[PDB]
């Protein structure tokens, strides 16, 4: 009875960052060496535990969130960051216990005529709270005269398309990101090693 990481990391389709996917992992044993054997392929930063010790640990839930961002935006996937992504798409707590894994995905997600399939939110009333998702597509009101659900002058579509070509300099290229969150609450533990 094993934990289904291959379903997150070997997924050929990945979510857009504004509608990021979450898989919940529980009721299994988590072999973190399946992930650490593959380290030439991702970048990886951990927060609140060490990478090596992960097998040793036990938690009440493990969460895996996945999405695609631009490379120079990977640095916002970290505690206490700001910018479009950290504030309007995906937000980590300050007390984040977990790992942020990322790999360059030019070859998978760029296309000579651009790939516009991946979206981000650029306007919102307020900065998301941690682990919050906004799928809403309703017109953001800038300016005073209110929009009637009609984009136009001072009224925007809140979602915007990345445009990915294989020519772009790294960091204007697409990166797949998996955020692993370790959550040890007060009920009985369920994920171990």
């Amino acid at each position: 009875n094993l934990c289904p990481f291959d379903e997150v990391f070997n997924a050929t389709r990945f979510a857009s960052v504004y509608a990021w996917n979450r898989k919940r992992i529980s009721n299994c044993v988590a072999d973190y060496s399946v992930l650490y054997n593959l380290a030439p392929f991702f970048t990886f930063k951990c927060y609140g535990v060490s990478p090596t010790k992960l097998n040793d640990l036990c938690f009440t839930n493990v969460y895996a969130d996945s999405f695609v961002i631009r490379g120079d935006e990977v640095r916002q996937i970290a505690p206490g960051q700001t910018g479009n992504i950290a504030d309007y798409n995906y937000k980590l707590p300050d007390d984040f216990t977990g790992c942020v894994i990322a790999w360059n995905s030019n070859k998978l997600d760029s296309k000579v005529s651009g790939n516009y399939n991946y979206l981000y939110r650029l306007f919102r009333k307020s900065n998301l709270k941690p682990f919050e998702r906004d799928i809403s597509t309703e017109i953001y009101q800038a300016g005073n005269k209110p929009c009637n659900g009609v984009a136009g002058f001072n009224c925007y579509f809140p979602l915007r398309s990345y445009s990915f070509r294989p020519t772009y300099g790294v960091g204007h290229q697409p990166y797949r990101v998996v955020v692993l969150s370790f959550e040890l609450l007060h009920p009985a533990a369920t994920v171990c090693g």
């Epitope: 379903e7 070997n10 997924a11 050929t12 389709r13 593959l38 392929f41």
Partner: antibody, heavy 126, light 107 residues
Framework: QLQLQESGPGLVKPSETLSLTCTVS??????????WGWIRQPPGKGLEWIGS???????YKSPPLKSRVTMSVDTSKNQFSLKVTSLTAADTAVYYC??????????????????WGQGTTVSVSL | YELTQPPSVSVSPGQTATITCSGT??????AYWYQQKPGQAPVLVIY???ERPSGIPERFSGSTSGTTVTLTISGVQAEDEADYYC??????????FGGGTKLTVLG
């Protein structure tokens, strides 16, 4: 000009074991984006993937058949092989050599099965 | 793990055909479409959800929406009579093919 050609017997006895060989022409079997695989089709029925293999010997195997499938890459002679133990009637099919165009580490079908051999008919009878 | 696909679709000439394919892991994995004509190797007509390889006519186009993907063959010709296979992969990354749909050009 990537083309593929299956070799292999046409008749095999039940229980015996099946041996297939695909030769690659027009490209190196070491193409970093190539996952060489086998798909079969029982006469009258639909396609079934058996397994794929990278130029390193990394082998992806269908779960129904994992127990009795083996594959190998002859880097020297630009070809890959399939072996299926304990044939039964249910193993009668056309067997297709194919190239999955994908990307490392494990996207062995990312861009689809875009180039196919044209099949070797395999027939499992006593 | 199983992709579900109508056994037969029939279409008047010059008109437009819809092959749907449903499977619970299409949220995780792209769809692929292969065309097979009698006694012959399958031919990839759609990779990832909607990419058309080079020598494939524009009337083939792929579409996704949830746990269903669809091949759409605009302006059907007689040559388009074939067997069409959707292909994806299960929760793990295991390739799986649908059952296939005969496309009959009526009239």
């Amino acid at each position: 000009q990537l083309q593929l050609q299956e070799s292999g017997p046409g008749l095999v006895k039940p229980s015996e074991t099946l041996s297939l060989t695909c030769t690659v022409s027009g490209a190196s079997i070491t193409s970093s984006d190539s996952y060489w695989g086998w798909i079969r089709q029982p006469p009258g029925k639909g396609l079934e993937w058996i397994g794929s293999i990278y130029y390193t010997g990394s082998a992806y195997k269908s779960p129904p058949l994992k127990s009795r499938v083996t594959m190998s890459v002859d880097t020297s002679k630009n070809q890959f092989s399939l072996k299926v133990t304990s044939l039964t009637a249910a193993d009668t099919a056309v067997y297709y050599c194919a190239r999955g165009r994908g990307s490392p580490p494990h996207y062995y079908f990312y861009f689809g099965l875009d180039v196919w051999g044209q099949g070797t008919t395999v027939s499992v009878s006593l | 793990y199983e992709l579900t696909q109508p056994p037969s679709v029939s279409v008047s000439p010059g008109q437009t055909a819809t092959i749907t394919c449903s499977g619970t892991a299409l949220p995780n994995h792209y769809a692929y479409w292969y065309q097979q004509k009698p006694g012959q190797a399958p031919v990839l007509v759609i990779y990832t959800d909607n990419e058309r390889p080079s020598g494939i006519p524009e009337r083939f186009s792929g579409s996704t929406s949830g746990t269903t993907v669809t091949l759409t063959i605009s302006g059907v010709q007689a040559e388009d009579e074939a067997d069409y296979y959707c292909q994806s992969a299960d929760s793990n990354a295991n390739v799986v093919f649908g059952g296939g749909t005969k496309l009959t050009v009526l009239g």
